[PDB]
């Protein structure tokens with residue numbers, strides 16, 4: 344569990360992210376696609392994108408980035424009590440999209456890298472550790488749902 348102090352660090356930097364959801368959302372998906380090309384293959388919707396320039400130019404990609412961050416934002420603001428928000432997400436990603444747990448770890452690294460790049464002053468080592476724990480909590484709860492459904 345994260346302490347109240349750790350949650351405050353997480354939410355403080357997340358408030359900054361909400362000032363430019365589209366920009367943050369776009370950078371995170373591009374980071375993920377570049378570092379782990381296999382993740383792009385899960386998206387029939389973005390499979391055609393080959394270069395980073397093509398990726399930055401896609402409005403549909405930017406739109407999806409907003410969907411991912413707003414859904415994650417809703418979860419983080421729940422400070423651990425995210426049962427109702429997480430269940431639906433685990434179900435679709437396990438049974439419909441077929442997203443292995445490892446890919447969730449990849450996008451977690453992408454989120455941390457982007458937060459560090461856009462907010463050096465508010466994303467120090469202490470905030471970085473708090474965010475990592477929050478994302479680990481996110482992955483832990485999702486993995487439990489996957490196991491229940493038979494997806495590891």
Ligand code: HEM
Nearest residue numbers: 382385386388410411414415431432435440442446447450
């Ligand atoms: C921070 C973690 C993530 C969050 C919050 C998230 C959230 C969402 C949401 C809200 C949707 C739309 C509704 C739904 O189907 O549930 C969605 C769709 C989808 N997600 Fe994720 N996702 C995450 C990570 C990933 C990862 C790591 C992958 C793939 C490697 C992925 C692949 C997909 C795909 C393929 C769709 C369907 C896209 C379409 O055809 O419109 N997601 N995700």
